[PDB]
Design a protein around this ligand. Sequence first.
Ligand code: NA
Ligand code: NA
Lengths: 200, 219, 203
Amino acid sequence: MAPVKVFGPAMSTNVARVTLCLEEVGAEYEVVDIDFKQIPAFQDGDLLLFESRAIAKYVLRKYKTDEVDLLREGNLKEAAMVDVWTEVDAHTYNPALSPIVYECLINPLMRGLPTNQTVVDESLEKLKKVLEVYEARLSQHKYLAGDFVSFADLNHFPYTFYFMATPHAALFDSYPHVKAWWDRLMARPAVKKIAATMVP
Amino acid sequence: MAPVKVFGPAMSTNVARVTLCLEEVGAEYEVVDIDFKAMEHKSPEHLVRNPFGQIPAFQDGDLLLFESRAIAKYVLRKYKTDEVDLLREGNLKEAAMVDVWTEVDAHTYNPALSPIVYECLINPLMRGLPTNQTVVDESLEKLKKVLEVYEARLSQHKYLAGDFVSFADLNHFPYTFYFMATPHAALFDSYPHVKAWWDRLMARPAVKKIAATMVPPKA
Amino acid sequence: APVKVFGPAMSTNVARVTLCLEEVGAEYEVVDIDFKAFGQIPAFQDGDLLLFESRAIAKYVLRKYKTDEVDLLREGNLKEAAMVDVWTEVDAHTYNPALSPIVYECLINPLMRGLPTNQTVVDESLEKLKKVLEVYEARLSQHKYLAGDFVSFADLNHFPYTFYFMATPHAALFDSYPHVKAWWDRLMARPAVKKIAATMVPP
Ligand code: NA
Ligand code: NA
C-alpha cells in the first residue's frame, strides 16, 4: 500500500535518476512538481530523504527482488563493479559531460545567458578521453558493470539524455560500442517512460 | 483548365516531384506554400483524409490527393499526349522499364543519396543540427555501389528506362539536385555516364524552371 | 507459350508476382532457383523479354492480362488508379517497413539464417506497426478494400509479408483492429490467394 512521493522539478536530472530507479523496480510512486529555495525530496510514510544518489539506492534496496537487483549488494564482485562505475559517472564522466548540457541547454533556455564556447570545447576534449575508456569497457561487456544492467548504467541516463539534445549528440557515433550501449539503455521500457517526462 | 493546386513548401523534394511533372506536361497550376507537418494540431477532416500526413496535398477540382508519387503519376496520366507520354503505359515493355527504375530510385538510390542531403543541407540550415559525418561516410559508400550500376546502365542508354526520358528519370531529380549543391557533387565526376545523364536532365527547360523554385526562403 | 518465374516460391517477391498471375488467370511456371549464388529477387521471362523486380513485374502482368472482369490497376480511371497508387506506396514505404522486420526476426532469422529472434527489433517494429494499423483500421471501416469498393494491386501487395506475419507470435495483433482483420480474411478467402498461400510453406 501507499505509493512514495518525489518532490522536485520533474525534468531535473536529480528527479530523473530517482524516477528511473522507481520504474525499474516497479514501485508505485507519485511525482509532485515543486521548485525550492539536495534537489529531489523523497517521502516514504514518515521517512523523508534528500539527495539523488542516496534516494536511488534507497529505492533499489527497498524494492529489491531476486530478479530485479540493480545494486547486487549480495555478490561482492558484481557490487564492486556497480560501485566503481557509479564513481566513474560521478567524478569522471559527468564532470566532463554535464557542463556541455548546462552551457548548450540550461544557460540559454532556463537561466538565460549565452553559450560559452571555451568551456564547451574544453568539456568536449575531456569527454572524448572519457569515451575512449568507455569504448573499451563496453567492447568487453554489454553494460558498465558486466553483462547485466545496474545502477551504474542507470546513473548515466539523465545527463546523457540531455546531452543527446545538444548539437553534439553525434559524438557518440564516433564510439560504436558506447553508442550501442546507449541504444541498449534507450530501449529499456523503464528508460523511455522517464525519457518522456523530459525535453525542455 | 481550372488550375490545379499543389499544397506544400516548394523547397520540399515531394513538392518538387509533383511540380516538375506538372511543368513537363505543360499543365496550369499554382503552388500554395504551407507546412501542414509543422502544425501539430489538425481538423478531423485532415486526419481522416490524410492520416499518414503524405506530402504534398493536391487539389484537382473536387478531388483531393496526397503522396507525391501517386500525385505525380496522376498528373502524368491526366495530361498525357502523344508527344509527352512519360509513363508509357501503352507500351508494356517500355512501361516495365519506367516502373523498374522508379523502384530503384524509391528503394535503392534515394535511400543511399538522401541521408547526405539531410546531413549536409536540410539539417545545418533548417534545423541547425551539424552534419553527422558518420552518417555521411556510410551513405557515400552505399551510394558509390549504386552509381556503378547507373554508370553501366547509362552507358547503354541516354535515360534510365531506355532511349527516352520518363517518370523514372524525373523521380531522381529533386533529391539529386540538393545532393549536387553539397561538396559531394564531385562524386559524380567518377561516373561520367551518370554525370552526362544528370547534365541532360539539368538542361531541360522544365527542370531549370523547378530548380529555380528550390531555394530556401528569406523572411 | 506460358511465362516463367525464376526464384524460390516461398520468397515474398516471388509470391507478389505469382499472386498477380493467379488473379489474372495466366498460365505460367515457377522455376525454383536462388539466383544470388541490384540482384532483384524474381526473374521473369515472357519469351523475348526478361524482367526483374517484383513490383515492376506484377504491374506488367496485371497490365498484359487486363480484362473487364480483372482490372487490378484501374489505369483507365484516373481517380481509382490514384487510390491504387497511394496505397501501393503506403505498403512500400509505411506498412512493409513496420511489419517486415517482425517476419524477419521471428521467422526468417531463426528458421533459415539460424539466428535467434532479436526482441528489441520486434518491440520497436511492433510500436511502429500499431500506429500504421490504426490508420488502416480507419480506412477499412470506410471501404472493403484499400483503394475503395474493389480489390486492387494495392491489396495484393500486402499479402506476402502479412501472410508470414500471421505465422509469428504476433499474428493476434490484428484482432485488435477488427476492420483490418475483416479485410485480411476477405483476402485470405480469395482463390488465387489460397493457391499462393499453399506454395509459401517450405520444408
Ligand atoms: Na515506391
Ligand atoms: Na522507404
